[PDB]
Design a protein around this ligand. Sequence first.
Ligand code: CLA
Ligand code: CLA
Ligand code: CLA
Ligand code: CLA
Ligand code: CLA
Ligand code: CLA
Ligand SMILES: CC1=C(/C=C/C(C)=C/C=C/C(C)=C/C=C/C=C(C)/C=C/C=C(C)/C=C/C2=C(C)CCCC2(C)C)C(C)(C)CCC1
Ligand SMILES: CC1=C(/C=C/C(C)=C/C=C/C(C)=C/C=C/C=C(C)/C=C/C=C(C)/C=C/C2=C(C)CCCC2(C)C)C(C)(C)CCC1
Ligand SMILES: CC1=C(/C=C/C(C)=C/C=C/C(C)=C/C=C/C=C(C)/C=C/C=C(C)/C=C/C2=C(C)CCCC2(C)C)C(C)(C)CCC1
Ligand SMILES: CCCCCCCCCCCCO[C@@H]1O[C@H](CO)[C@@H](O[C@H]2O[C@H](CO)[C@@H](O)[C@H](O)[C@H]2O)[C@H](O)[C@H]1O
Ligand code: OEX
Ligand SMILES: [Cl-]
Ligand SMILES: [Cl-]
Ligand SMILES: [Fe+2]
Ligand SMILES: [Mg+2]
Lengths: 37, 451, 334, 36, 27, 62, 81, 341, 36
Amino acid sequence: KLPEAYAIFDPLVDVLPVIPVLFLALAFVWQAAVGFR
Amino acid sequence: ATNRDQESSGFAWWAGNARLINLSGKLLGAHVAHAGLIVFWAGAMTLFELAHFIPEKPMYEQGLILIPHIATLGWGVGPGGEVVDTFPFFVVGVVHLISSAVLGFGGVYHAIRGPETLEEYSSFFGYDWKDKNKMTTILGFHLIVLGIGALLLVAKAMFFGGLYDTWAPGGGDVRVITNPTLDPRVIFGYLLKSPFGGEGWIVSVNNLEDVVGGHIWIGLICIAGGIWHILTTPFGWARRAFIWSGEAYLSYSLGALSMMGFIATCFVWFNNTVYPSEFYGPTGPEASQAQAMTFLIRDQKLGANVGSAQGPTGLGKYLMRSPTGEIIFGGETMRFWDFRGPWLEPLRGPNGLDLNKIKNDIQPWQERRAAEYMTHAPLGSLNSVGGVATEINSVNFVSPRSWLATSHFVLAFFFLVGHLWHAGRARAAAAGFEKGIDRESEPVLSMPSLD
Amino acid sequence: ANLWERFCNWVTSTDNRLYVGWFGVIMIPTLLAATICFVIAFIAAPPVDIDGIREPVSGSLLYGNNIITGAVVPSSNAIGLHFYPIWEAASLDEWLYNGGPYQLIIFHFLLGASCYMGRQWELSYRLGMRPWICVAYSAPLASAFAVFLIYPIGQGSFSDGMPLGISGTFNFMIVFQAEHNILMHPFHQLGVAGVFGGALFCAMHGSLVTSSLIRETTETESANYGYKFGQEEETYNIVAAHGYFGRLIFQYASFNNSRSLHFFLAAWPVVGVWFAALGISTMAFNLNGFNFNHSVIDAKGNVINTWADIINRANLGMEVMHERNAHNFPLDLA
Amino acid sequence: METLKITVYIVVTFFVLLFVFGFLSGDPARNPKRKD
Amino acid sequence: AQLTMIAMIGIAGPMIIFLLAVRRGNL
Amino acid sequence: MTILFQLALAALVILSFVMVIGVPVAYASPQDWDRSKQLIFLGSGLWIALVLVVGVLNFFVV
Amino acid sequence: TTGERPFSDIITSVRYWVIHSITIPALFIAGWLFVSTGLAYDVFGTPRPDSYYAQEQRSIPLVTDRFEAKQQVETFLEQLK
Amino acid sequence: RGWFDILDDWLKRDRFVFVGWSGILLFPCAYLALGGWLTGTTFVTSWYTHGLASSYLEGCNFLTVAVSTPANSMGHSLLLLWGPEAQGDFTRWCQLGGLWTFIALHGAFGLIGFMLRQFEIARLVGVRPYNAIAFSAPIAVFVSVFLIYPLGQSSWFFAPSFGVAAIFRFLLFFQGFHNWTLNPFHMMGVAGVLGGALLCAIHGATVENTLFQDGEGASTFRAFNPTQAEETYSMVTANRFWSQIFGIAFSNKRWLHFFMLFVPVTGLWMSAIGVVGLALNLRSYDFISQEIRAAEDPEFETFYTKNLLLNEGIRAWMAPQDQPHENFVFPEEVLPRGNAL
Amino acid sequence: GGRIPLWIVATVAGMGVIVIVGLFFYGAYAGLGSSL
Ligand code: CLA
Ligand code: CLA
Ligand code: CLA
Ligand code: CLA
Ligand code: CLA
Ligand code: CLA
Ligand SMILES: CC1=C(/C=C/C(C)=C/C=C/C(C)=C/C=C/C=C(C)/C=C/C=C(C)/C=C/C2=C(C)CCCC2(C)C)C(C)(C)CCC1
Ligand SMILES: CC1=C(/C=C/C(C)=C/C=C/C(C)=C/C=C/C=C(C)/C=C/C=C(C)/C=C/C2=C(C)CCCC2(C)C)C(C)(C)CCC1
Ligand SMILES: CC1=C(/C=C/C(C)=C/C=C/C(C)=C/C=C/C=C(C)/C=C/C=C(C)/C=C/C2=C(C)CCCC2(C)C)C(C)(C)CCC1
Ligand SMILES: CCCCCCCCCCCCO[C@@H]1O[C@H](CO)[C@@H](O[C@H]2O[C@H](CO)[C@@H](O)[C@H](O)[C@H]2O)[C@H](O)[C@H]1O
Ligand code: OEX
Ligand SMILES: [Cl-]
Ligand SMILES: [Cl-]
Ligand SMILES: [Fe+2]
Ligand SMILES: [Mg+2]
């Protein structure tokens, strides 16, 4: 368990580690927005 | 946009990071932002691991890989690896997570806002890939950084609390290392040890005095070679040996990383010293040795004479000899007789497993350890069903050693593929035929026929 | 030119009938050593106590086997991962009993086949080609490392490596399914899609090119004589082939770029077989295929069987019967 | 057995030495285009 | 709880792209 | 304090969400850059301060 | 090039999405209700989680007669009440 | 230009999806085969034919769903919806495995429609019909495995069920009962498949690595133009590379591409013949000379005798649930087992 | 014709695919088929 002051942020901490994968997919959103030029 | 389409850059979108080869400002930003991704994950995973963590369950039952790395450093653990404090795991997670916003900022800054090239702005931060002296200078700068990092581990072990020591007498405990092994016949002796069974090369390192003294040696070697590469230029034999370009230097690091990932895969699989079994679970060899120990203990409690019990094949059902004659556990686990662990080594005499020690001196903590390790063998499914492939659903377990070994085998394999890809491409690019064969001077057309 | 310069010029010479090269100075003796010891051990080796239980398995032709049942048998389970060269044995008779030839063959072969990969880079460098044929060969080479080296390392014994024989290969497969449920592993499934797809795309590319060959011959001759070695014109009509295949499915499912087509022909089997190699190599550390045994449960709690439970029943029969004298304790942990 | 061990070690060292010194013998220049 | 956190984090990426697209940014 | 902790953390979490969106759009819109740089400089030091404020007020709420 | 309208032109137009932001969620919700109302069990004869076995039945209701198979299933279903 | 020629005009219009006369057979039969599989794997049980859950509605995933074969008491019944088993009741028809024969028969006539489509398009565009000829191998495999194999057996029950794990069971059944790996026709199929995958990988890599520099980009795909007369890669350089690496090399591009047809097509045809034998249980199960020797010499062991012990395990452990029409009660003491396990 | 940019369409369609498949993997651990 996190220290009990931080336990409000338990839903947010549960989704934090997947954030790096979103950077890989964000590179494709950006390339699609520029037409894969 | 400079170099951000295929016509101007020569590279398609799917090879679009190759457009950064000669744009050192944006290329720096790519590396700093990617460094922030690593540090983000190290922080975010630790906080995830800590938020899911039950202190009364073992770490290896809970799908944790980063908390055991912190615990092995000596933080937050007591005797036998029980967690005495979760605050050091919270600090390590938070400080990494905050620092990745810092690395993320400068990565984003150099990659979108800063100068595309550093060469006009600064001669010190600018570089040609072909400037061999600038290449060895930055190599020397990073070698010093790594050597200081290796001495940070020595400083943790000697002057800032110690390390978790699974071989500490009277059970595993955090122990301050006072006399690290500085003798180079021991330290470099692991380098000449065979990688095969019973030897195991550097994976066999079995005591923290060897671990700490090796990192002393590595830290001083990396500082020496750091200062050496800052003050030298490559000799002529190295200039005529290597390809001198950015893609080539990438490929050398790719082969280096692939080799290191294969090494770490074997480290986590076999070594129970720097990956303690209280944190990572038993090794593969350990659990098989622990099953043979469990059924020796139970059957000898029922009255069996385990030294004289013949198996179906005529080998000893519990105890037999290794090919050099040491007394070892029988059954299929004869292959794992090189296993060494703190729960087993009390039973082992000069010629192997001691029958008098086995009859009299097996403590209840060893029997508890053998049963726990036998039932937490690193075998399980991709959906994390523990045990053999034929086991029914109930137990939710895949050992961290299996997760760490399999992941790092995959990564080390693809990094070897990347090494081959980039090393072949760097040779063809330096020799000038990476875009294909010139029709007006095709090389095979001026060679004689083979027949 | 001194002798070393004359020697280096010969070694890397593009005029040799088979290219030697620096990888070849390792590839040639190791493969010759592995081949010679293989042929001898396949013909004439005595039986081998593979499972370390004094129960020697006959592998050679002279000791009863045929081509299908013959094998060079993996080394003894008593050896484990220990390095067992000839000079470690007290006699050649002991070396042969303990499965010495297997270790000699696989180590020389894997060293030689790695150098075969480097030799493929090396000649492409000498010929001015692009360098990535050796990346395509890394797919079968990794598979060979997976079954001969990586799987023994994870399981702790060269007795668990793939035997050098046709029936021993099938024994390796059945036992592997029993212990790892490889069919239910997605990396083997990706591997199957690689080889099925590779065979499909081989037949597809072969048929489409053959279908669009330009008429250069009469009826009384083979069409292959319509192509001359080293001619500059292409021998088939790629626009006609794209016009066919783009109408067989739909236009945008068909390649009109031959470079994109041939890259797809390289990429599909290679990536799949790479994944098949990582299947074996990660099941080496016992991360097994998907286990859905007793996953479907009714309202009371009755197990409702699926096809996965039927697979498990087959896996149990393989499990309980394999190496039927080798297990003394109730779990097969490696 | 010792004599076999010394023979094989000598043989292996000889071939490894040819590989290492051979790849050190200006290998990037042995190509049909940039013979620098 | 986690669903609304991931839906906000998952929006923040493509919102950087969409806002830079309509501000004539240096995409 | 205690409200001044989960306020300051949720102020840090919210401000980081404005820095994550607002910094690349400000860096990659070179139109109105001059008014973005003071906004970047301000939110940078405000972010570093809230981290220090949460880290100091961590120890009063344990 | 065969005369029909390009797919990039269709899915980017507003009129496609005016039509399809209703049709696509309506078909999804219709499929959801096919399961959630339980109709899928009745149409296909698939057992609900409480209708594989009678309460003390351990035996599977396997069809054993080709021409009375329809009657065997019906008998197996009457055995569940 | 009667009504037939007007209909022939419309069927062969250049449109996005070509129809043709073959499309009258292909399109409904293929869609019902695909739609029948997606319907059964989403909603239909196998509870009455096999005692198995096999749909998403029951709880199965993509790997475990199947449209399972009918009960063994169905025999080789066509299981028509209006036939004497279902008698028109769609719900009963689904429960009797009527979807399996629905998929197998619509799939069979759909495959016939696909090869007709290959012939029809090849005739219209003016190319030779080698793609239709190569497709006879997947047709031979489907016909032998899903039709001839169960027709030789007791019922449709022993055909593969249309599903991922169901297909894996079929593989394990053929090992334990037929010893199908020992069969030389299967071995020829394995060589054709793995050879074709080798040929796919080796030909694609060779072309891509003997490309002519026809442009300035480092991404070399743009340097091909679909209308060029010239070869995009060097056959001469490819030939010299493989002659020196491997000893032999193709020198005739037409023979090379024929050999790429020939290898996996011949392999699949060879595997079909072995399955036709297994329809009658004409297995390559044993080697008699090894069985005579092993029965009299209890020290004689090969990998072949080891595999038969595995086969005996597979049969005794899987048969009671895999064949629940046999009502096998094998008491635990009859089960073949090794020591400990 | 071209009113919603195709990269927006691809991103929303690609995300809904992720959400639906993500629900399917969630359903592997809850309710039917989860072994509990
Ligand atoms: C680790 C992942 C990674 C990183 C760090 C980079 C980095 C880079 N890429 Mg590469 N790339 C990647 C993966 C990555 N890439 C992948 C997976 C692909 C295939 C899709 C590519 C394909 C590709 C192409 C085709 C090109 C690049 C280019 C670039 C460079 C400039 C990008 C640009 O013009 O932004 C413009 C886009 C924006 C300004 C929109 C938003 C982007 C910002 C950075 C998002 C930041 C979000 C983050 C949450 C903010 C936190 C702030 C906080 C810390 C305060 C940059 C150094 C370009 C280049 O080489 O230039 C010469 C180029 O042409 N990339
Ligand atoms: C060194 C890398 C590594 C290792 C060993 C682990 C190991 C683990 N993770 Mg962690 N994690 C990682 C990286 C890693 N993770 C990354 C990068 C993320 C961000 C997404 C996470 C985020 C994360 C979360 C949120 C959770 C875990 C959990 C776990 C545990 C269970 C894993 C599981 O069920 O997987 C499921 C298996 C898969 C998803 C299949 C993986 C197959 C991969 C993708 C193949 C990749 C091959 C290749 C690189 C890709 C193709 C490229 C090729 C063409 C070249 C296990 C200890 C769980 C846990 O127990 O927490 C306490 C958990 O809840 N991880
Ligand atoms: C590999 C990392 C790296 C490198 C080589 C550079 C290099 C550069 N940066 Mg960049 N930058 C980085 C990361 C990096 N930066 C990070 C992480 C941030 C976020 C804080 C930035 C934010 C940034 C801005 C806003 C600017 C630069 C600028 C510059 C240029 C001049 C800086 C200088 O000489 O100050 C002199 C250096 C010092 C007085 C000492 C450095 C102080 C740090 C804190 C020491 C840290 C060392 C320590 C080992 C790191 C701890 C963490 C570690 C464990 C990873 C130079 C090209 C300038 C530029 O773009 O010029 C055009 C500029 O305006 N940087
Ligand atoms: C990341 C770390 C790193 C990197 C990239 C480099 C890179 C380089 N070094 Mg430097 N060096 C380093 C760390 C590093 N060094 C450190 C830490 C020290 C202090 C010990 C040195 C001391 C040093 C000296 C004295 C010299 C170099 C030189 C060089 C250059 C050529 C080296 C070469 O040809 O290697 C390839 C190696 C060979 C061709 C020799 C044969 C090696 C055998 C065949 C390999 C055996 C390893 C095998 C895998 C087994 C491993 C286990 C084994 C122990 C049993 C190259 C730029 C040379 C130079 O140019 O000086 C300016 C040089 O003279 N380095
Ligand atoms: C430190 C490691 C490293 C670095 C810095 C580079 C850098 C580079 N590579 Mg190399 N490469 C590497 C490792 C590396 N590579 C490895 C390990 C492999 C083996 C797989 C390769 C194989 C490779 C090939 C075949 C090629 C390159 C190319 C390049 C250049 C362009 C990259 C680009 O724009 O891709 C943009 C990024 C993408 C298109 C996305 C890649 C996605 C991968 C395949 C799947 C990842 C899946 C993920 C792990 C899990 C799934 C998550 C998902 C569901 C979200 C760039 C110089 C190109 C080149 O040669 O230029 C000169 C090129 O053609 N690389
Ligand atoms: C080209 C399209 C095509 C083809 C080849 C098939 C083929 C088949 N269907 Mg499928 N089907 C199709 C389209 C097709 N179907 C479509 C579009 C639907 C949706 C409506 C279906 C729905 C469907 C169901 C529900 C079932 C089938 C079944 C079958 C199988 C048996 C059919 C049969 O025996 O009827 C025989 C009819 C003929 C052979 C027509 C004869 C025409 C002659 C030459 C003219 C004489 C007719 C005569 C004048 C009639 C007078 C009647 C009077 C004497 C009383 C057969 C494989 C059955 C099955 O799959 O078994 C498991 C089944 O249950 N089909
Ligand atoms: C360039 C480029 C790119 C990339 C990008 C990157 C890679 C970046 C990075 C970034 C980063 C790397 C970032 C980071 C950030 C972070 C942050 C933002 C953090 C935050 C933190 C916080 C605030 C925390 C909080 C807390 C606490 C304190 C306690 C506990 C709880 C919690 C966790 C809540 C791409 C690919 C797109 C493409 C284009 C170009
Ligand atoms: C730590 C922290 C934080 C931070 C965070 C961040 C850093 C974030 C980021 C984020 C991101 C970074 C995001 C991203 C996202 C992305 C996405 C969502 C993507 C998607 C994709 C897709 C879906 C794709 C698609 C496609 C296309 C486009 C084209 C091609 C094809 C396809 C279809 C594939 C905060 C502030 C909260 C605070 C608290 C703590
Ligand atoms: C049988 C029958 C019939 C018919 C029906 C039909 C025709 C149906 C259809 C149906 C359908 C037609 C359905 C559909 C379904 C779908 C689905 C179920 C989907 C799913 C999807 C997904 C899940 C995806 C995934 C993926 C992949 C695949 C790859 C890539 C990645 C991803 C992940 C995206 C009738 C009435 C005539 C008569 C009686 C019987
Ligand atoms: C593993 C044991 C050896 C470890 C070696 C570590 C130190 C490496 C330096 C040793 C010397 C290497 O030095 C290298 O020697 C060779 C051998 O003549 C020189 O000489 C070479 O000249 C040219 C190179 O273009 C070749 O065509 C020629 O065949 C060869 O004689 C190379 O030009 C030099 O670069
Ligand atoms: O050796 Mn060959 O097979 Ca791999 O598990 Mn343990 O050990 Mn034996 O049993 Mn199962
Ligand atoms: Cl066996
Ligand atoms: Cl055992
Ligand atoms: Fe071709
Ligand atoms: Mg469910």
